[PDB]
């Protein structure tokens with residue numbers, strides 16, 4: 531029975547995790563900087579607190595742009611790699627499964643503080659096969675070096691090939707009417723990254739590798755993602771993101787969610803989210819291919835009554851994930867404000883809770899971990915909070 535295989539068990543072993551967001555991914559004027567977006571430097575204590583809270587995994591998005599020497603070698607500045615190495619091993623010290631990647635290098639929108647510097651350019655790769663070739667060489671050289679640095683680190687360290695690749699229009703643009711050209715290239719980049727990771731030798735030969743689809747959208751993934759040919763069986767996982775529905779979870783234009791909410795995104799609640807998880811479960815988990823959410827979340831609310839809807843959202847979706855053998859990592863950017871972009875629940879320097887962050891963390895983790903067979907989507911649903919409208 532493929533859903534009962536070792537790879538899906540490894541997928542589930544990541545449980546509910548946490549992103550060191552706006553940290554090694556932060557960047558401006560063409561260069562990443564750990565503190566560049568207001569977060570202070572991570573410490574062992576950061577990761578200790580994560581393990582203590584019950585997270586099983588941690589994702590350290592890294593933006594490499596600015597620390598890459600010239601072609602043809604694309605040498606990564608050693609200090610930058612040292613710091614990545616160092617963090618990965620702090621996480622290992624705390625008993626966490628660890629994910630690293632190529633992050634804002636691939637940022638595909640126009641709203642960037644590093645305009646002109648995103649070498650990982652999907653429109654430009656589609657535009658010409660020559661520029662597609664340069665990008666592939668750079669992806670190769672970068673993954674070879676990362677692989678070589680971590681050759682003695684085992685399957686507790688996961689590599690995620692790319693982040694959220696796109697053309698600016700978030701999966702509503704030319705990708706829907708170019709005859710699959712954008713999707714074909716992205717699949718080719720994943721292939722090239724997997725090739726390079728495996729060629730790094732050592733424990734990279736049997737390391738789990740996460741591969742995304744277009745803009746990390748679950749549906750565009752199930753429709754167009756082609757899993758790369760691999761040198762070993764059962765060592766690829768599908769990476770997806772979800773902040774659905776965005777205007778509730780991300781922008782906080784609406785502040786309630788689900789069947790008991792009144793201030794809701796219209797017609798988009800419990801059924802839609804589980805439908806999305808079911809398509810992933812039928813496409814991948816049922817076929818022995820693990821899926822994880824590299825990023826999921828909902829921002830913090832100003833009122834206690836709206837916050838209860840946030841906890842409800844977490845309890846419900848995280849249970850639905852558990853039951854579909856899907857693991858997931860919460861997006862934490864360190865920002866303690868409420869509303870738009872207010873994702874911070876754990877301090878990035880100390881690993882202590884920010885504001886009421888503990889309730890959210892407990893909500894997502896406990897719901898996923900719960901092994902009481904009476905605790906179901908029905909019971910969670912029936913205890914949805916009361917609308918304050």
Ligand SMILES: OC[C@H]1O[C@@H](O[C@H]2[C@H](O)[C@@H](O)[C@H](O[C@H]3[C@H](O)[C@@H](O)[C@H](O)O[C@@H]3CO)O[C@@H]2CO)[C@H](O)[C@@H](O)[C@@H]1O
Pocket residue numbers: 551552555567568637641642643693694771825861863871873
């Ligand atoms: O605060 C200073 C800088 O913030 C930058 O915005 C970032 C958000 O604060 C962050 O939460 C968001 O996270 C992304 C994630 O990186 C991505 O993989 C996924 O697709 O969506 C998440 C949630 O949107 O990233 C943005 C930037 O990409 C500003 O860009 C910057 O100008 C500002 O100084």
